[PDB]
Amino acid sequence: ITRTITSANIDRLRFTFGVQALVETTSKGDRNPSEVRLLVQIQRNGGWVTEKDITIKGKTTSQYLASVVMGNLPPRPFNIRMRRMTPDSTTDQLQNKT
Amino acid sequence: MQDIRQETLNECTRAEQSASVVLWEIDLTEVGGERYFFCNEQNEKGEPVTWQGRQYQPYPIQGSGFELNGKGTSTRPTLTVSNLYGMVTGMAEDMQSLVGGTVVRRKVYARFLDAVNFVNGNSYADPEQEVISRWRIEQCSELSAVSASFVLSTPTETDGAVFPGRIMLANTCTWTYRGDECGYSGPAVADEYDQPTSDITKDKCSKCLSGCKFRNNVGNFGGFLSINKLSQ
Amino acid sequence: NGKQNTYFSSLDNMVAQGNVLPVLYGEMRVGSRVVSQEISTADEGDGGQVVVIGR
Amino acid sequence: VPEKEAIVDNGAHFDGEQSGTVNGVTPPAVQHLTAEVTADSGEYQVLAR
Ligand code: SF4
Question: Whose C-alpha lies nearest to ligand 1, atom 2?
Answer without folding.
Answer: B212
